[PDB]
Amino acid sequence: SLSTIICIGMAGSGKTTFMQRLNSHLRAEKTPPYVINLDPAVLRVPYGANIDIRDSIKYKKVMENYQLGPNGAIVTSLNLFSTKIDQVIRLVEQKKDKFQNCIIDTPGQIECFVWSASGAIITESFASSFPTVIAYIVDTPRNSSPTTFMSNMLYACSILYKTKLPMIVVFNKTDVCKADFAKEWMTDFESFQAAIKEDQDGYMSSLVNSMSLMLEEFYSQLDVVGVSSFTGDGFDEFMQCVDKKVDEYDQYYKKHH
Amino acid sequence: SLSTIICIGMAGSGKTTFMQRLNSHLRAEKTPPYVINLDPAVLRVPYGANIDIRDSIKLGPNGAIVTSLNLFSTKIDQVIRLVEQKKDKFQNCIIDTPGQIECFVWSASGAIITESFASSFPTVIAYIVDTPRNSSPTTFMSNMLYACSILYKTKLPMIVVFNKTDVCKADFAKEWMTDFESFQAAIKEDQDGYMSSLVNSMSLMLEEFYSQLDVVGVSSFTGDGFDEFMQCVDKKVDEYDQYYKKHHH
Ligand SMILES: Nc1nc2c(ncn2[C@@H]2O[C@H](COP(=O)(O)OP(=O)(O)O)[C@@H](O)[C@H]2O)c(=O)[nH]1
Ligand SMILES: Nc1nc2c(ncn2[C@@H]2O[C@H](COP(=O)(O)OP(=O)(O)O)[C@@H](O)[C@H]2O)c(=O)[nH]1
Numbered sequence: 001s002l003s004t005i006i007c008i009g010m011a012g013s014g015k016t017t018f019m020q021r022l023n024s025h026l027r028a029e030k031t032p033p034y035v036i037n038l039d040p041a042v043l044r045v046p047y048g049a050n051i052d053i054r055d056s057i058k059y060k061k062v063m064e065n066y067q068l069g070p071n072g073a074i075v076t077s078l079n080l081f082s083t084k085i086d087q088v089i090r091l092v093e094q095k096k097d098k099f100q101n102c103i104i105d106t107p108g109q110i111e112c113f114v115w116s117a118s119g120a121i122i123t124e125s126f127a128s129s130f131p132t133v134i135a136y137i138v139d140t141p142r143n144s145s146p147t148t149f150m151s152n153m154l155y156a157c158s159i160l161y162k163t164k165l166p167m168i169v170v171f172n173k174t175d176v177c178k179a180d181f182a183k184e185w186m187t188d189f190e191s192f193q194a195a196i197k198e199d200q201d202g203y204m205s206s207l208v209n210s211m212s213l214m215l216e217e218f219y220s221q222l223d224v225v226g227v228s229s230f231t232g233d234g235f236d237e238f239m240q241c242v243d244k245k246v247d248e249y250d251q252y253y254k255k256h257h
Numbered sequence: 258s259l260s261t262i263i264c265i266g267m268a269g270s271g272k273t274t275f276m277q278r279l280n281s282h283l284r285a286e287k288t289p290p291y292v293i294n295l296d297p298a299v300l301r302v303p304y305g306a307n308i309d310i311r312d313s314i315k316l317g318p319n320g321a322i323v324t325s326l327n328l329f330s331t332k333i334d335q336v337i338r339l340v341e342q343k344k345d346k347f348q349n350c351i352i353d354t355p356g357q358i359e360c361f362v363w364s365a366s367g368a369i370i371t372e373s374f375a376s377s378f379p380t381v382i383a384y385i386v387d388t389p390r391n392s393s394p395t396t397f398m399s400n401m402l403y404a405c406s407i408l409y410k411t412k413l414p415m416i417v418v419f420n421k422t423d424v425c426k427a428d429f430a431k432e433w434m435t436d437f438e439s440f441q442a443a444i445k446e447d448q449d450g451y452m453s454s455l456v457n458s459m460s461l462m463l464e465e466f467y468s469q470l471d472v473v474g475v476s477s478f479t480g481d482g483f484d485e486f487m488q489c490v491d492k493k494v495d496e497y498d499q500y501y502k503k504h505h506h
């Protein structure tokens with residue numbers, strides 16, 4: 001019965017803080033999740049994790065023993081973990097009627113998780129055993145430039161395609177910067193064309209014009225919410241987007257896994 | 258035996274000029290193509306077309322274009338059969354499209370037309386890039402994302418064609434696609450902060466996109482680069498057989 005929520009997003013966008021607040025929110029609803037941390041580099045985890053990659057794998061140690069830098073040691077830790085993925089999935093399976101959701105925190109860097117073989121295997125394993133939803137975390141205060149916003153959205157699209165999972169775009173940190181502008185840009189594309197024309201010269205506008213149709217087709221697939229992981233604002237709405245995406249998953253997405 | 262080349266690109270990038278030069282180049286190689294024009298809005302066509310959408314077909318701009326495409330797509334079976342009849346008399350079928358790219362690949366009728374050709378012949382997308390306009394790293398990247406979305410939408414092999422190299426050489430772009438750290442450097446210099454950060458993660462994603470493409474620089478004015486383009490076409494026809502034919506029935 002359990003569904004899996006995988007938090008994915010740019011470093012510093014708030015994945016871990018979002019995870020903490022989601023956890024407290026679900027517990028307050030008397031539906032505490034099963035919590036997994038897959039960031040091997042993190043120093044302390046500000047919530048209780050049921051499975052922590054750092055337990056089986058000592059991140060500094062893999063750095064030293066394998067002689068690689070940050071990105072390498074993160075991906076190596078993920079490889080080692082992915083070795084035990086069958087066991088992990090079975091563990092979650094045992095708990096699948098005791099917990100409404102399994103929620104998963106990922107490495108800080110998005111590409112360490114979705115463009116590594118091992119991260120893709122981990123994701124595929126979860127997708128193949130439970131309804132699984134990608135919560136794509138957006139650092140809202142940093143995406144006010146229309147070109148930055150659009151690049152970020154193209155990236156989310158590529159992730160949507162790569163993972164073949166339903167996506168919820170989560171504009172985080174609304175306590176600093178509200179997400180109205182972005183919702184509008186995704187809803188009324190002529191506003192985005194206006195922002196682009198003002199901000200950027202010429203060809204961009206024209207480019208963005210054709211992309212209007214393409215982007216609209218992307219945005220229709222998404223669910224979209226604004227949250228503050230500091231205040232807990234918007235999380236009820238996120239969980240509604242989760243239930244919707246679990247439904248869609250059943251119909252549309254289950255066939256791909 | 259014939260393969261189909263569909264020219265797709267931003268308005269003004271040179272699709273029609275590229276078609277003219279490709280036509281003359283192929284005729285010079287004693288392998289004249291079967292020529293199709295699918296731009297209903299064009300005033301004169303600077304080459305001889307075997308099938309012109311304007312013949313059968315005489316809101317606003319994009320509405321009328323898409324409507325013309327609908328009407329045309331009604332006769333797509335006939336069109337395909339016509340090309341099929343000629344498939345051993347012509348080495349290639351080359352296709353010019355509406356000025357606006359979304360009129361053709363994000364309309365139902367344009368998608369049907371493309372699917373029909375993909376289902377009957379090896380079909381390759383020549384994605385035409387207006388090189389002088391894509392010197393800004395962000396503009397270039399947006400354009401490339403767009404090409405990627407097209408690659409996915411059409412499920413066809415893609416050749417990125419940096420056109421107008423007589424005005425602006427395509428070295429910089431080839432470099433950006435080949436050596437990604439150079440692109441990161443161009444972005445860091447040109448743009449602040451979050452965009453650079455963005456472009457870092459995308460490095461892996463974009464590398465995966467670029468590895469699928471073939472890439473050529475041409476001048477449709479001088480004919481420079483077209484031999485190379487046709488080599489890319491042959492390569493893509495091979496790939497099409499193996500990898501792509503399974504996605505089209
Ligand atoms: N104002 C505000 N700051 C946030 C929020 N979420 C995260 N942050 C801050 O952004 C930084 C990165 O957060 P973190 O949870 O570590 O992001 P992660 O790298 O994606 O896992 C931290 O200093 C957070 O306190 C939020 O909802 N509101
Ligand atoms: N220098 C140069 N200019 C070109 C080339 N190809 C096209 N052009 C110019 O760019 C425009 C081409 O428009 P066109 O071929 O109709 O683009 P379309 O809308 O995609 O069909 C014209 O102004 C041409 O003079 C080229 O290879 N070199």
Ligand SMILES: [Mg+2]
Pocket residue numbers: 015016017039042108
């Ligand atoms: Mg974190």
Ligand SMILES: [Mg+2]
Pocket residue numbers: 272273274296299356
């Ligand atoms: Mg034209």
